[PDB]
């Protein structure tokens, strides 16, 4: 009986191997051969955002494309002005320990949450004028990994113990729950058109969840460790993945396989956070040793390296308006690029 | 003719102290502008770095004011500059070097408390706390330097070639001069010398007795600093002592003349040398000054 | 129970294998026309004059 | 010049200053990352001392411990312990009664990248009950190559050697201590430890050391 | 709820002194900055005084500095207005009004209920009317112009619009001479070009017949008061 | 104060070489190591260059070098 089916495991696993090497009649850099290299990617700090104490593990952009969220060991999550550098929150946890925080795409809300196992929802246009915590999202067994808001009533999560998740604030219940990882999930990003997320888990396998049903739709296993950081491409259609093994990889969604491996032999440490520019041309990847390189997506071509960090650099973004890039570090400060 | 005889002088060995003045004026302001900057508000941020900020702002004054003192001797003593000059150059020299030994003195100190009496540092530490024992250093050397602002004063006679920045002591019976003296071997030398080794002693008794505190490195930094401060300022200090205290019938202040400059000299060593610990000692610093 | 994990993982490998796949050529060409089609309108891929730049 | 948001300027200051205050309430603290096998004693070491991730604090000769209990966490140890890099110390502690995974994370712990130069105060626990097992069981059932007598003394010595023959960095210095399960006294072997500690790092900072 | 009630009103005789407090409950009192605003009792409003967050800022009117001083009193929420050396122009009714500055906020986002006090180079707002009848149902424009552009480098234009009910304490519409404040149905809306500005009324409702306050926040100054009428 | 005793002992100088060196013997140099031989004049500068460093030993002003 069982020994069948694993047996059937294994034929599945060949017919859809099969059926990829089918649909591989190129290769992304063959195709790409023709393009022109973005050139130079000359980039300087405009701003050193400084005011934490510890370790800045996360970051994440509002969709207003000028303000900010910074979420740091020293157990203040606080929200800067990027123009200005002016602090226009700062908020305290309730533990320490945080390893994830976004904005919410309208800017009413941010969220939170690491080794505590839950998810913090913060109300910031609260009309007592302070910050308050709104609802604790209880109920993963791990410490939680990522997260991201599709509205302000809905956020999806990341959690250590290998599953995602996604939430319905208003009851915080768990709306629909994405079992399927072996090992334990890391980062997490949304399509743009936001019906379908894909998550990258220390099992160095990376997979695409419908948000309404709950259901897989593929899975990707190029990478030979686990995988840290994950991000959907501007389109949609495809998204890239870092990982411990020191390269970065694009998949397409369509085309359901690896179409390129970013790579170059000096780089012998993991990614710990990855993202795009605004047209997709480049890949932002933020290294162990110090710096984020720039990787000429279409190409594999290293276009730039953004040195400046006395430590790991633990986060990145880019505007949604595309002007600027921001990377947390270790070193308790943000830097933005442009 | 002007006069019966000319002579270029015979400018005596220690009279050569040009050498000492021109090393100390190159290798130090570089590497005191860079450890002052290094330890600027930035890294001053953090308590540690405020003692070592006041240290090197002192002994980046004392080199920037260096050159008055090399022109003169390279000019045969003679003080070509007015005496607006003469009555603070002198004084902010001496102000700024009192306050670095007394900064020293008072680092050995603040390391001997956060060995001696760690949990109570950590407790009242704090950057404003640092600045208050830096500005009691600093209001010592003031203190010490008051009779270099109220007594110091230029002259000369039937000589139009020459004149000196000198001390003017008239009035009454009172010894003016070995007055001065005693206070500034007391407190300006022998208190801090006293405080070095009193400090340091008992902090490598305690640190080498746990094993986890236990380094050669601390016993090392520590026998350089004592022993070259003793080393290059004792000569002036003793120095300072005998030009006041032998009867001016001299008996043998014909060397104290020209040494006296050596002296100085060998002083302003020390000044050179106190960067030098900072940036060799530290826990790193081979690229702080740019990731500052 | 240990079999019935197992046939859930035959079930959503038969759901991933049904999937329809086109050729890596045609998504190479979709990524290579989305990046063309936003050369004009990438801040970092072009650097953004000093006048609109919101930081300098 | 600014606008009237020279009123949000001054907000960021007051913000700063709120900052500046808790970083200066909360460098007054001594942080230990406390590990252990299961049923151990990580707990009892707390409960005898006065008091997801479990934070664990109590006040002794004037500093402020927290002592976090990371162990609870069921999950890849390997992507979240580099959250407590720059712990003051780890408070490892082991059951004798018990064996080898204590010897297998006590490896692992030691010899991690980023604890590279933390110290470790090892407890060995259940020194009381480890003489009843000894005196009826001998170390040759956990330790087959134990060519030494079936004494408390040498046993016991020869568990803490082992453990500390996993240490492979100079640099770093374990306290080992027998809890004995009546204590009150770990809070001293604590304080001493962390003495040690904090006195070598003032000297880091000052360059003596 | 928010509260912003203030105490200590009655009669004076001119060259008197006497002390308004402010007592504040239902929000993180110790964050805001403070204001305080005066209506005479047959006049437009006027702006008296602000203590900032922390009481590290406090200006006033030119015509009242030297005479009164403003005080918050943060652990007991409490603000308050020693009013010295009163004059004739002194007698109104004073506001307590609430403000916070950072990005994206909305000052004079909440008022008093106030008291009344009665005794024995600046941007000037002007408003083209001082009264016009409506109808429910129908659409309205009001506008108000400044002396000077209040459209800062910066790219804001720091104007605001208040409504004041009979009998009613004023309540913020409009600030920055677009954004709608919290609570304001989107009946409300406002445009301006830096130096000319107007907010428009569509569908409006009985209950929505008041005087209507623009006040520029460029440089530490209200309009004379629209008023409407059924 | 006392300044005008080299003129007054300069006086008694009849001649214009023993008057010229005395009165240069006033001088500042830190007779007999400045003056081994004149260039009629020593019989005055002896006298006059000993009153110089009598004169000048009694002054309270010290040349100190300073630092």
Redesign the interface.
């Known amino acids: 009986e069982l020994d069948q089916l694993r047996q059937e495991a294994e034929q599945l696993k060949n017919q859809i191997r099969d059926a990829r090497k089918a649909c591989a009649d190129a290769t992304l850099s063959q195709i790409t051969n023709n393009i022109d290299p973005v050139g130079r990617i000359q980039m300087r700090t405009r701003r050193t955002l400084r005011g934490h104490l510890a370790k800045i593990y996360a970051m994440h952009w509002g969709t207003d494309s000028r303000l900010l969220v910074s979420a740091s060991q020293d157990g203040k999550l606080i929200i800067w002005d990027s123009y200005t550098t002016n602090k226009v929150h700062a908020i305290p946890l309730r533990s320490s320990w945080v390893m994830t925080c976004a904005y919410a795409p309208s800017g009413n809300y941010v969220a939170c949450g690491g080794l505590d196992n839950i998810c913090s929802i913060y109300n910031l246009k609260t009309r007592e004028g302070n910050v308050r915590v709104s609802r604790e999202l209880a109920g993963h067994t791990g410490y939680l990994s990522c997260c991201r808001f599709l509205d302000d009533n809905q956020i999806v999560t990341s959690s250590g113990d290998t599953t995602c998740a996604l939430w319905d604030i208003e009851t915080g219940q768990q709306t629909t729950t994405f079992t399927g990882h072996t090992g334990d999930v890391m980062s997490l990003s949304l399509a743009p058109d936001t019906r379908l997320f894909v998550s990258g888990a220390c099992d160095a396998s990376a997979k695409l969840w419908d948000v309404r049903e709950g259901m897989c739709r593929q899975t990707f296993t190029g990478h030979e460790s686990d995988i840290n950081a994950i991000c959907f491409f501007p389109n949609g259609n495809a998204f890239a993945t870092g990982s411990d093994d020191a390269t970065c990889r694009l998949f397409d969604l369509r085309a359901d396989q690896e179409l390129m491996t970013y790579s170059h032999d000096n780089i012998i440490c993991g990614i710990t956070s990855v993202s795009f520019s605004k047209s997709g041309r480049l890949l932002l990847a933020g290294y162990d040793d110090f710096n984020c390189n720039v990787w000429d997506a279409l190409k594999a071509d290293r276009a730039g390296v953004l040195a400046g960090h006395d430590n790991r650099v633990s986060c990145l973004g880019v505007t949604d308006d595309g002007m600027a890039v921001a990377t947390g570090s270790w070193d308790s400060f943000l830097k933005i690029w442009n | 003719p002007a006069?019966?005889?000319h002579l270029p002088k015979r400018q005596p060995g220690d009279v050569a102290a040009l050498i000492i003045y021109s090393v100390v004026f190159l290798v130090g302001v570089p590497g005191n502008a860079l450890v002052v900057w290094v330890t600027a508000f930035e890294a001053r941020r953090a308590v540690?770095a405020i003692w070592f900020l006041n240290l090197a702002v002192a002994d980046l004054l004392s080199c920037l004011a260096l050159p008055?003192?090399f022109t003169?001797?390279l000019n045969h003593?003679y003080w070509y500059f007015d005496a607006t000059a003469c009555i603070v150059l002198?004084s902010l020299?001496?102000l700024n070097?009192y306050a670095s030994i007394l900064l020293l003195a008072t680092i050995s100190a603040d390391?001997f408390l956060?060995?001696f009496k760690?949990?109570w540092?950590?407790?009242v530490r704090?950057t404003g706390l640092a600045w208050m024992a830096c500005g009691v250093a600093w209001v010592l050397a003031l203190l010490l330097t008051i009779p270099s602002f109220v007594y110091r004063?230029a002259?000369?006679?039937?000589?139009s070639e020459?004149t000196?920045?000198?001390?003017?002591?008239?009035?009454g019976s009172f010894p003016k001069?070995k007055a001065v003296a005693i206070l500034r071997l007391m407190v300006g030398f022998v208190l801090p010398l006293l405080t070095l080794n009193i400090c340091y002693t008992f902090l490598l008794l305690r640190?080498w007795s746990?094993?986890?505190?236990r380094?050669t490195?601390?016993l090392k930094?520590?026998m350089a600093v004592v022993i070259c401060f003793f080393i290059f300022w004792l000569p002036?200090q003793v120095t300072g002592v005998m030009?006041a205290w032998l009867p001016?019938?001299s008996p043998t202040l014909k060397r104290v003349?020209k040494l006296?400059?050596l002296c100085?000299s060998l002083?302003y060593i020390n000044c050179c040398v106190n960067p030098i610990?900072?940036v060799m000692?530290?826990?790193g610093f081979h690229g702080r000054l740019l990731?500052s | 129970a240990s079999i019935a994990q197992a046939r859930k993982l035959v079930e959503q490998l038969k759901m991933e294998a049904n999937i329809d796949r086109i050729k890596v050529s045609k998504a190479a060409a979709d990524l290579m026309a989305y990046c063309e089609a936003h050369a004009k309108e990438d801040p970092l891929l072009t650097p953004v004059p000093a006048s609109e730049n919101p930081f300098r | 010049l600014s606008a009237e948001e020279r009123a949000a300027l001054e907000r960021s200051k007051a913000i700063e200053k709120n900052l500046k205050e808790d970083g200066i309430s909360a460098a007054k603290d001594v942080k230990l990352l406390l590990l252990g096998a299961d049923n151990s004693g990580k707990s009892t070491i707390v409960k005898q001392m006065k008091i997801g991730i479990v934070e664990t604090h109590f006040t002794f000769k004037n500093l402020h411990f927290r002592l976090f209990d990371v162990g609870g966490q069921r999950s890849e140890r390997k992507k979240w312990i580099h959250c407590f890099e720059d712990v003051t110390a780890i408070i490892f502690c082991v059951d004798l009664s018990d064996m080898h995974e204590s010897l297998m994370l006590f490896d692992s712990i030691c010899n991690n990248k980023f604890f590279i130069d933390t110290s470790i105060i090892l407890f060995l626990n259940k020194k009381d009950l480890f003489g009843e097992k000894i005196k009826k069981s001998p170390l040759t059932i956990c330790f087959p190559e134990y060519t030494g007598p079936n004494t408390y003394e040498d046993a016991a010595a020869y568990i803490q050697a082992q453990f500390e023959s996993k240490n492979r960095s100079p640099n770093k210095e374990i306290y080992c201590h027998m809890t004995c399960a009546t204590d009150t006294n770990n809070a001293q072997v604590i304080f001493d430890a962390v003495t040690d500690i904090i006195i070598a790092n003032n000297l880091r900072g000052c360059g003596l050391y | 709820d928010v509260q912003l009630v203030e105490s200590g009103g009655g009669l004076v005789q001119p060259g008197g002194s006497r002390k308004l407090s402010c007592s504040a409950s239902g929000f993180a009192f110790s964050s805001f900055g403070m204001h305080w605003v005066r209506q005479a009792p047959e006049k437009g409003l006027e702006w008296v005084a602000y203590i900032s967050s922390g009481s590290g800022t406090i200006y006033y009117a030119d015509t009242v500095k030297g005479r009164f001083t403003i005080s918050r009193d943060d652990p007991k929420n409490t603000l308050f207005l020693q009013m010295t050396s009163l004059r004739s122009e002194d007698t109104a009714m004073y506001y307590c009004v609430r403000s916070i500055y950072y990005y994206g906020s909305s000052p004079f986002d909440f008022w008093g209920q106030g008291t009344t006090l009665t005794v024995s180079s600046d941007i000037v707002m002007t408003q083209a009317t001082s009264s016009v009848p409506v109808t429910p149902g129908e659409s309205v424009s009001i506008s108000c112009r400044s002396s000077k552009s209040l459209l800062h480098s910066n790219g804001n234009t720091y104007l605001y619009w208040f409504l004041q009910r009979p009998g009613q304490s004023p309540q913020l519409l409009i600030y920055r001479m677009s954004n709608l404040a919290s609570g304001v149905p989107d009946r409300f809306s406002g445009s301006g070009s830096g130096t000319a500005f107007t907010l428009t009324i569509s569908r409006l409702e009985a209950e929505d017949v008041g005087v209507y306050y623009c006040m520029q926040h460029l440089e530490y100054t209200f309009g004379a008061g629209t008023k409407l009428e059924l | 104060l006392l300044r005008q005793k080299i003129e007054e002992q300069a006086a008694k100088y009849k001649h214009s070489v023993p008057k010229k060196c005395c009165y240069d013997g006033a001088r500042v140099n830190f007779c007999e190591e400045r003056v081994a031989r004149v260039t009629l004049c020593i019989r005055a500068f002896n006298e006059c260059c000993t009153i110089a460093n009598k004169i000048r030993k009694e002054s309270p002003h010290k040349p100190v070098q300073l630092g």
């Open positions: 006069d019966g005889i540690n008055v003192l003169t001797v003593n002198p020299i001496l070097m390391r956060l060995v760690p949990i540092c950590q407790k704090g004063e002259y000369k006679d039937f000589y020459h000196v920045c000198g001390i003017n002591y008239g009035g001069e640190t746990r094993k986890a505190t380094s490195k601390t930094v520590v002036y030009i001016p019938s003349e006296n400059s100085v002083a610990i900072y000692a530290g826990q990731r």
